[PDB]
Amino acid sequence: LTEISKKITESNAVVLAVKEIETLLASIDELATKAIGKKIQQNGGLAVEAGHNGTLLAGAYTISKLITQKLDGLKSEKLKEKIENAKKCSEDFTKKLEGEHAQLGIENVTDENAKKAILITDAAKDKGAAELEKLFKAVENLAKAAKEMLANSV
Amino acid sequence: LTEISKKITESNAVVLAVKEIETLLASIDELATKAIGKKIQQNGGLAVEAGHNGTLLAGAYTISKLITQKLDGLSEKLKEKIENAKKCSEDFTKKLEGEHAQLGIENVTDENAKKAILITDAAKDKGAAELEKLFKAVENLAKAAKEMLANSVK
């Protein structure tokens, strides 16, 4: 019974650490679905302001660089393959954004190009969003396995 | 007792839900410290691109509203700590809206963006002071939630 408390707390530490990565991905999705081409509006809400998404994409870039860092701190023989798959997907996403600097690494990034980078429901998603979509799937799979380990401990 | 396990899972759900809010705040701090006045750089990293922070602030505004929603989703022990954080989250959102003249444009200067979301900014008079209070209210809420989970696991 002394082993169970040690097993529950340490497996919950993985669930908490994975939740951090899940939420970082959700914040990118929130920037993509709500903030692209927008500006703060008088009396609340967002108003349309097309084509100046350069600093917003720098923010998604920085969060992608936080996501791989969190994946590096994860270390479990059962989750080794699922963790390493998420880390490769997180690096691919960051590298794809870097490769599209000609269109994404400017101030006046168009709404279309910003969506192609970070909006996973974008039709073309050929400037990073397809890599972001794989990163979502890899992290969701890692979360499901971690949540099952905590349920088996309890 | 088998009933204790019900206490562990339900109190761990609170820890997970608060961690989600903490991470949303960390993403805003990551936008503030790294992305303001920046753009994606060829070969990696971020390059200087002053101003044009308007859509980045729209993203911080959107994440601030997600934080308020998550605080609404939250335990008769933590009611005052939850209500205090919810009040701080609404104050932060309302402060950003009130500064729409300087924050609700395309070409938001680096200085004004930092006054809004960079809690280490010296002036911090366009929202960052409210953000700093929100950080403190959430970290105090997190400490209380993890203390309740530690009492359950023993």
Author numbering:
A (entry chain B): 42 to 116, 118 to 196
B (entry chain A): 42 to 115, 118 to 197
According to the publication:
Outer surface protein C (OspC) plays a pivotal role in mediating tick-to-host transmission and infectivity of the Lyme disease spirochete, Borreliella burgdorferi. OspC is a helical-rich homodimer that interacts with tick salivary proteins, as well as components of the mammalian immune system. OspC consists of four long α-helices, two shorter α-helices (4 and 5), and two short antiparallel β-strands located between α1 and α2 (23, 24). The biologically functional molecule is a dimer (with monomers referred to here as OspC-OspC′) that assumes a knob-shaped structure anchored via an N-terminal lipidated moiety in the spirochete’s outer membrane.
To elucidate the structural basis for B5 IgG’s specificity for OspCA, we solved the crystal structures of recombinant OspCB and OspCK at 1.5-Å and 1.9-Å resolution, respectively, in the P21 space group. OspCB and OspCK each formed homodimers nearly identical to those of OspCA (unbound or bound to B5). Specifically, OspCB and OspCK monomers each consisted of four long α-helices, two shorter α-helices (4 and 5), and a two-stranded β-sheet. The monomeric form of OspCA (with or without B5 Fab bound) was structurally more similar to OspCK than OspCB, with an RMSD of ~0.7 Å for all atoms. By ELISA, B5 IgG reacted with OspCA but had no detectable reactivity with either OspCB or OspCK. Superpositioning the B5-OspCA complex onto OspCB and OspCK revealed additional structural attributes that likely account for B5’s inability to recognize OspCB and OspCK. In OspCB and OspCK, Glu-175 is superposed with OspCA Gly-174. The bulkier and negatively charged Glu-175 side would be expected to clash (sterically and electrostatically) with Trp-100, thereby impeding B5 interaction. In the case of OspCK, divergent primary amino acid sequences at consequential residues further contributed to a lack of B5 recognition. For example, OspCA Lys161 forms a π-cation interaction with B5 Trp-100, which cannot occur in the case of OspCK due to an Ile residue at this position.
